[PDB]
Amino acid sequence: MNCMTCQVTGEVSDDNLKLAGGKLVLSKEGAEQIISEIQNQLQNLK
Amino acid sequence: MNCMTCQVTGEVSDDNLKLAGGKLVLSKEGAEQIISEIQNQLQNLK
């Protein structure tokens, strides 16, 4: 048996987040704004 | 064609960052740890 858990921290959420692959270019502030979107999706799905 | 720049902020970097994809599962704290890795890749090549 297995479950969706964080490989970097070990936390398990029902709304769980996924690692990057590169659909569009962002800078330092763009990437952190994606993490605002990602952490907001974990907090409540849009 | 055109230069690489942030579509979310408008900033350009020499080691510019890229959007999500879905490569492995993380939680809220794991995804922000990827932000630490991402912003560190941009910051270590200036």
mmCIF file of N, CA and C in Angstrom:
data_model
loop_
_atom_site.group_PDB
_atom_site.id
_atom_site.type_symbol
_atom_site.label_atom_id
_atom_site.label_comp_id
_atom_site.label_asym_id
_atom_site.label_seq_id
_atom_site.Cartn_x
_atom_site.Cartn_y
_atom_site.Cartn_z
ATOM 1 N N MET A 1 0.848 -1.222 0.000
ATOM 2 C CA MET A 1 0.000 0.000 0.000
ATOM 3 C C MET A 1 0.874 1.260 0.000
ATOM 4 N N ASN A 2 0.423 2.332 -0.663
ATOM 5 C CA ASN A 2 1.089 3.644 -0.703
ATOM 6 C C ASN A 2 0.076 4.810 -0.634
ATOM 7 N N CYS A 3 0.566 6.022 -0.354
ATOM 8 C CA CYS A 3 -0.224 7.258 -0.289
ATOM 9 C C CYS A 3 0.594 8.469 -0.785
ATOM 10 N N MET A 4 -0.081 9.524 -1.251
ATOM 11 C CA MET A 4 0.552 10.756 -1.737
ATOM 12 C C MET A 4 1.101 11.601 -0.581
ATOM 13 N N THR A 5 2.415 11.519 -0.370
ATOM 14 C CA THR A 5 3.157 12.244 0.671
ATOM 15 C C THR A 5 4.302 13.060 0.074
ATOM 16 N N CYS A 6 4.670 14.146 0.748
ATOM 17 C CA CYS A 6 5.782 15.003 0.379
ATOM 18 C C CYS A 6 7.128 14.269 0.459
ATOM 19 N N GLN A 7 7.875 14.188 -0.645
ATOM 20 C CA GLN A 7 9.215 13.576 -0.638
ATOM 21 C C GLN A 7 10.290 14.475 0.022
ATOM 22 N N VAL A 8 10.017 15.777 0.184
ATOM 23 C CA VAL A 8 10.957 16.787 0.726
ATOM 24 C C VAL A 8 10.730 17.090 2.221
ATOM 25 N N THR A 9 9.515 16.856 2.736
ATOM 26 C CA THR A 9 9.121 17.133 4.142
ATOM 27 C C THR A 9 8.466 15.939 4.840
ATOM 28 N N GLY A 10 7.734 15.114 4.085
ATOM 29 C CA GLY A 10 6.999 13.948 4.603
ATOM 30 C C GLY A 10 5.540 14.235 4.979
ATOM 31 N N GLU A 11 5.028 15.432 4.673
ATOM 32 C CA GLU A 11 3.624 15.798 4.889
ATOM 33 C C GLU A 11 2.679 15.264 3.805
ATOM 34 N N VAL A 12 1.493 14.843 4.236
ATOM 35 C CA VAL A 12 0.439 14.241 3.399
ATOM 36 C C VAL A 12 -0.868 15.033 3.496
ATOM 37 N N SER A 13 -1.293 15.599 2.366
ATOM 38 C CA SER A 13 -2.513 16.393 2.197
ATOM 39 C C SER A 13 -3.428 15.806 1.110
ATOM 40 N N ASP A 14 -4.741 16.021 1.220
ATOM 41 C CA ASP A 14 -5.724 15.556 0.220
ATOM 42 C C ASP A 14 -5.711 16.394 -1.074
ATOM 43 N N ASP A 15 -5.303 17.660 -0.969
ATOM 44 C CA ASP A 15 -5.217 18.661 -2.033
ATOM 45 C C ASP A 15 -3.786 18.795 -2.610
ATOM 46 N N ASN A 16 -2.954 17.756 -2.440
ATOM 47 C CA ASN A 16 -1.487 17.799 -2.503
ATOM 48 C C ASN A 16 -0.873 18.407 -3.780
ATOM 49 N N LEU A 17 0.273 19.059 -3.581
ATOM 50 C CA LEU A 17 1.040 19.853 -4.539
ATOM 51 C C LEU A 17 2.024 18.995 -5.344
ATOM 52 N N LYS A 18 2.452 19.481 -6.514
ATOM 53 C CA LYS A 18 3.383 18.760 -7.400
ATOM 54 C C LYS A 18 4.539 19.632 -7.910
ATOM 55 N N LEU A 19 5.677 18.982 -8.171
ATOM 56 C CA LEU A 19 6.968 19.589 -8.525
ATOM 57 C C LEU A 19 6.994 20.139 -9.962
ATOM 58 N N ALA A 20 7.941 21.029 -10.250
ATOM 59 C CA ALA A 20 7.953 21.854 -11.461
ATOM 60 C C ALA A 20 8.499 21.133 -12.712
ATOM 61 N N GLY A 21 8.182 21.651 -13.908
ATOM 62 C CA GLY A 21 8.620 21.063 -15.189
ATOM 63 C C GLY A 21 8.851 22.079 -16.319
ATOM 64 N N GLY A 22 8.152 23.219 -16.292
ATOM 65 C CA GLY A 22 8.495 24.421 -17.054
ATOM 66 C C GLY A 22 7.632 24.669 -18.290
ATOM 67 N N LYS A 23 6.418 25.195 -18.077
ATOM 68 C CA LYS A 23 5.476 25.565 -19.156
ATOM 69 C C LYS A 23 5.670 26.981 -19.720
ATOM 70 N N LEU A 24 6.198 27.902 -18.911
ATOM 71 C CA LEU A 24 6.431 29.316 -19.251
ATOM 72 C C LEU A 24 7.570 29.898 -18.403
ATOM 73 N N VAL A 25 8.203 30.981 -18.864
ATOM 74 C CA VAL A 25 9.296 31.665 -18.153
ATOM 75 C C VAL A 25 8.795 32.759 -17.205
ATOM 76 N N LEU A 26 9.344 32.725 -15.992
ATOM 77 C CA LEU A 26 9.141 33.643 -14.874
ATOM 78 C C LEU A 26 10.495 34.082 -14.288
ATOM 79 N N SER A 27 10.557 35.215 -13.589
ATOM 80 C CA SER A 27 11.742 35.612 -12.805
ATOM 81 C C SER A 27 11.540 35.244 -11.333
ATOM 82 N N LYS A 28 12.442 35.668 -10.443
ATOM 83 C CA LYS A 28 12.428 35.398 -8.991
ATOM 84 C C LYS A 28 11.047 35.671 -8.377
ATOM 85 N N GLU A 29 10.475 36.809 -8.772
ATOM 86 C CA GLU A 29 9.191 37.279 -8.254
ATOM 87 C C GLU A 29 8.009 36.556 -8.916
ATOM 88 N N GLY A 30 8.121 36.227 -10.209
ATOM 89 C CA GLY A 30 7.138 35.387 -10.869
ATOM 90 C C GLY A 30 7.084 33.987 -10.250
ATOM 91 N N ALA A 31 8.233 33.335 -10.030
ATOM 92 C CA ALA A 31 8.273 32.005 -9.426
ATOM 93 C C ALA A 31 7.657 32.040 -8.022
ATOM 94 N N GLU A 32 8.007 33.055 -7.214
ATOM 95 C CA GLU A 32 7.374 33.127 -5.885
ATOM 96 C C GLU A 32 5.850 33.390 -5.966
ATOM 97 N N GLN A 33 5.380 34.123 -6.989
ATOM 98 C CA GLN A 33 3.944 34.325 -7.225
ATOM 99 C C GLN A 33 3.234 33.021 -7.632
ATOM 100 N N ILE A 34 3.909 32.137 -8.378
ATOM 101 C CA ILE A 34 3.395 30.774 -8.595
ATOM 102 C C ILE A 34 3.299 30.049 -7.261
ATOM 103 N N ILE A 35 4.297 30.141 -6.382
ATOM 104 C CA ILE A 35 4.169 29.492 -5.065
ATOM 105 C C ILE A 35 3.049 30.056 -4.203
ATOM 106 N N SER A 36 2.726 31.337 -4.360
ATOM 107 C CA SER A 36 1.498 31.882 -3.788
ATOM 108 C C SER A 36 0.280 31.151 -4.366
ATOM 109 N N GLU A 37 0.199 30.972 -5.695
ATOM 110 C CA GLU A 37 -0.892 30.209 -6.328
ATOM 111 C C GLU A 37 -0.925 28.739 -5.877
ATOM 112 N N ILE A 38 0.224 28.055 -5.839
ATOM 113 C CA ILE A 38 0.330 26.653 -5.434
ATOM 114 C C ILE A 38 -0.112 26.476 -3.972
ATOM 115 N N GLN A 39 0.467 27.234 -3.042
ATOM 116 C CA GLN A 39 0.132 27.106 -1.623
ATOM 117 C C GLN A 39 -1.331 27.496 -1.352
ATOM 118 N N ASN A 40 -1.862 28.449 -2.121
ATOM 119 C CA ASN A 40 -3.288 28.784 -2.112
ATOM 120 C C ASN A 40 -4.160 27.619 -2.622
ATOM 121 N N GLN A 41 -3.735 26.842 -3.627
ATOM 122 C CA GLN A 41 -4.465 25.651 -4.089
ATOM 123 C C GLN A 41 -4.468 24.537 -3.025
ATOM 124 N N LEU A 42 -3.357 24.334 -2.297
ATOM 125 C CA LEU A 42 -3.333 23.426 -1.131
ATOM 126 C C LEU A 42 -4.296 23.902 -0.031
ATOM 127 N N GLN A 43 -4.342 25.215 0.216
ATOM 128 C CA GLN A 43 -5.217 25.814 1.230
ATOM 129 C C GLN A 43 -6.714 25.703 0.864
ATOM 130 N N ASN A 44 -7.076 25.956 -0.399
ATOM 131 C CA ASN A 44 -8.399 25.707 -0.980
ATOM 132 C C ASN A 44 -8.312 25.605 -2.519
ATOM 133 N N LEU A 45 -8.775 24.493 -3.105
ATOM 134 C CA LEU A 45 -8.755 24.296 -4.562
ATOM 135 C C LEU A 45 -9.711 25.271 -5.280
ATOM 136 N N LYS A 46 -9.226 25.907 -6.353
ATOM 137 C CA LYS A 46 -9.978 26.871 -7.183
ATOM 138 C C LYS A 46 -10.982 26.183 -8.122
ATOM 139 N N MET B 1 13.474 34.769 -31.774
ATOM 140 C CA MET B 1 12.219 35.561 -31.903
ATOM 141 C C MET B 1 12.177 36.704 -30.883
ATOM 142 N N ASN B 2 11.964 36.411 -29.592
ATOM 143 C CA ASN B 2 11.887 37.393 -28.497
ATOM 144 C C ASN B 2 12.682 36.917 -27.263
ATOM 145 N N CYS B 3 13.076 37.854 -26.394
ATOM 146 C CA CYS B 3 13.832 37.571 -25.168
ATOM 147 C C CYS B 3 12.974 36.887 -24.085
ATOM 148 N N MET B 4 13.602 36.050 -23.252
ATOM 149 C CA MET B 4 12.963 35.421 -22.089
ATOM 150 C C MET B 4 12.740 36.429 -20.958
ATOM 151 N N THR B 5 11.479 36.630 -20.580
ATOM 152 C CA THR B 5 11.042 37.510 -19.491
ATOM 153 C C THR B 5 9.826 36.933 -18.768
ATOM 154 N N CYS B 6 9.626 37.317 -17.509
ATOM 155 C CA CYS B 6 8.472 36.939 -16.710
ATOM 156 C C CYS B 6 7.151 37.433 -17.320
ATOM 157 N N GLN B 7 6.187 36.546 -17.588
ATOM 158 C CA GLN B 7 4.847 36.975 -18.038
ATOM 159 C C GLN B 7 3.922 37.405 -16.872
ATOM 160 N N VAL B 8 4.289 37.091 -15.622
ATOM 161 C CA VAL B 8 3.520 37.422 -14.397
ATOM 162 C C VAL B 8 3.976 38.741 -13.743
ATOM 163 N N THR B 9 5.226 39.163 -13.976
ATOM 164 C CA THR B 9 5.824 40.381 -13.374
ATOM 165 C C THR B 9 6.482 41.302 -14.403
ATOM 166 N N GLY B 10 7.068 40.718 -15.453
ATOM 167 C CA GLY B 10 7.782 41.450 -16.513
ATOM 168 C C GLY B 10 9.301 41.525 -16.317
ATOM 169 N N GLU B 11 9.836 40.853 -15.292
ATOM 170 C CA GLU B 11 11.271 40.798 -14.998
ATOM 171 C C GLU B 11 12.018 39.738 -15.814
ATOM 172 N N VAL B 12 13.240 40.070 -16.212
ATOM 173 C CA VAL B 12 14.163 39.198 -16.964
ATOM 174 C C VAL B 12 15.405 38.879 -16.129
ATOM 175 N N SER B 13 15.808 37.602 -16.112
ATOM 176 C CA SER B 13 17.090 37.171 -15.523
ATOM 177 C C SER B 13 17.919 36.243 -16.421
ATOM 178 N N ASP B 14 19.230 36.217 -16.168
ATOM 179 C CA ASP B 14 20.240 35.394 -16.848
ATOM 180 C C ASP B 14 20.068 33.888 -16.579
ATOM 181 N N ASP B 15 19.501 33.539 -15.418
ATOM 182 C CA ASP B 15 19.060 32.183 -15.062
ATOM 183 C C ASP B 15 17.570 32.199 -14.684
ATOM 184 N N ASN B 16 16.754 32.706 -15.613
ATOM 185 C CA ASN B 16 15.304 32.819 -15.470
ATOM 186 C C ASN B 16 14.618 31.469 -15.180
ATOM 187 N N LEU B 17 13.558 31.551 -14.381
ATOM 188 C CA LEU B 17 12.811 30.456 -13.764
ATOM 189 C C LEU B 17 11.654 30.000 -14.664
ATOM 190 N N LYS B 18 11.110 28.803 -14.425
ATOM 191 C CA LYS B 18 10.031 28.225 -15.246
ATOM 192 C C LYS B 18 8.879 27.652 -14.402
ATOM 193 N N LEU B 19 7.678 27.624 -14.991
ATOM 194 C CA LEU B 19 6.402 27.272 -14.335
ATOM 195 C C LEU B 19 6.314 25.789 -13.894
ATOM 196 N N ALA B 20 5.226 25.410 -13.213
ATOM 197 C CA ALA B 20 4.961 24.039 -12.752
ATOM 198 C C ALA B 20 4.906 22.999 -13.900
ATOM 199 N N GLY B 21 4.722 21.713 -13.579
ATOM 200 C CA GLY B 21 4.590 20.638 -14.578
ATOM 201 C C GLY B 21 3.872 19.423 -13.987
ATOM 202 N N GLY B 22 4.433 18.890 -12.899
ATOM 203 C CA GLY B 22 3.802 17.927 -11.989
ATOM 204 C C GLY B 22 4.642 16.668 -11.762
ATOM 205 N N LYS B 23 5.932 16.851 -11.451
ATOM 206 C CA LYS B 23 6.968 15.805 -11.557
ATOM 207 C C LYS B 23 6.990 14.798 -10.387
ATOM 208 N N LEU B 24 6.700 15.250 -9.163
ATOM 209 C CA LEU B 24 6.577 14.442 -7.932
ATOM 210 C C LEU B 24 5.687 15.166 -6.904
ATOM 211 N N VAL B 25 5.115 14.460 -5.921
ATOM 212 C CA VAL B 25 4.195 15.034 -4.919
ATOM 213 C C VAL B 25 4.929 15.638 -3.716
ATOM 214 N N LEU B 26 4.503 16.851 -3.369
ATOM 215 C CA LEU B 26 4.901 17.662 -2.219
ATOM 216 C C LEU B 26 3.652 18.193 -1.491
ATOM 217 N N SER B 27 3.766 18.571 -0.216
ATOM 218 C CA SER B 27 2.720 19.337 0.484
ATOM 219 C C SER B 27 3.071 20.825 0.471
ATOM 220 N N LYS B 28 2.305 21.656 1.186
ATOM 221 C CA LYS B 28 2.476 23.124 1.273
ATOM 222 C C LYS B 28 3.939 23.510 1.541
ATOM 223 N N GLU B 29 4.540 22.802 2.498
ATOM 224 C CA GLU B 29 5.900 23.076 2.970
ATOM 225 C C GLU B 29 6.952 22.567 1.976
ATOM 226 N N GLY B 30 6.692 21.422 1.332
ATOM 227 C CA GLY B 30 7.529 20.948 0.248
ATOM 228 C C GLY B 30 7.514 21.907 -0.941
ATOM 229 N N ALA B 31 6.347 22.388 -1.384
ATOM 230 C CA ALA B 31 6.255 23.277 -2.541
ATOM 231 C C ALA B 31 6.999 24.592 -2.266
ATOM 232 N N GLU B 32 6.829 25.154 -1.062
ATOM 233 C CA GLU B 32 7.649 26.339 -0.730
ATOM 234 C C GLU B 32 9.157 26.023 -0.623
ATOM 235 N N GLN B 33 9.529 24.800 -0.212
ATOM 236 C CA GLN B 33 10.931 24.390 -0.280
ATOM 237 C C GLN B 33 11.439 24.353 -1.729
ATOM 238 N N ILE B 34 10.612 23.946 -2.706
ATOM 239 C CA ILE B 34 10.967 24.100 -4.126
ATOM 240 C C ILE B 34 11.164 25.582 -4.443
ATOM 241 N N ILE B 35 10.326 26.502 -3.939
ATOM 242 C CA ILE B 35 10.605 27.942 -4.139
ATOM 243 C C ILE B 35 11.981 28.360 -3.638
ATOM 244 N N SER B 36 12.408 27.814 -2.502
ATOM 245 C CA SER B 36 13.754 28.060 -1.987
ATOM 246 C C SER B 36 14.803 27.535 -2.973
ATOM 247 N N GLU B 37 14.629 26.322 -3.522
ATOM 248 C CA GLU B 37 15.537 25.807 -4.561
ATOM 249 C C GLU B 37 15.513 26.679 -5.832
ATOM 250 N N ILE B 38 14.327 27.040 -6.333
ATOM 251 C CA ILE B 38 14.128 27.801 -7.572
ATOM 252 C C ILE B 38 14.771 29.195 -7.472
ATOM 253 N N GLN B 39 14.373 29.968 -6.461
ATOM 254 C CA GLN B 39 14.926 31.298 -6.234
ATOM 255 C C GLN B 39 16.435 31.232 -5.953
ATOM 256 N N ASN B 40 16.916 30.169 -5.298
ATOM 257 C CA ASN B 40 18.355 29.924 -5.151
ATOM 258 C C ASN B 40 19.067 29.647 -6.491
ATOM 259 N N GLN B 41 18.459 28.940 -7.458
ATOM 260 C CA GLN B 41 19.064 28.762 -8.780
ATOM 261 C C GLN B 41 19.208 30.116 -9.471
ATOM 262 N N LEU B 42 18.153 30.945 -9.460
ATOM 263 C CA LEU B 42 18.274 32.301 -10.016
ATOM 264 C C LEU B 42 19.339 33.153 -9.301
ATOM 265 N N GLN B 43 19.431 33.048 -7.974
ATOM 266 C CA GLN B 43 20.317 33.883 -7.157
ATOM 267 C C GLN B 43 21.803 33.483 -7.252
ATOM 268 N N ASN B 44 22.116 32.202 -7.482
ATOM 269 C CA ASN B 44 23.497 31.690 -7.525
ATOM 270 C C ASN B 44 24.215 31.872 -8.885
ATOM 271 N N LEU B 45 23.570 32.515 -9.868
ATOM 272 C CA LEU B 45 24.113 32.753 -11.215
ATOM 273 C C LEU B 45 23.805 34.186 -11.702
ATOM 274 N N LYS B 46 24.273 35.178 -10.930
ATOM 275 C CA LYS B 46 24.161 36.629 -11.192
ATOM 276 C C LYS B 46 25.540 37.300 -11.263
#
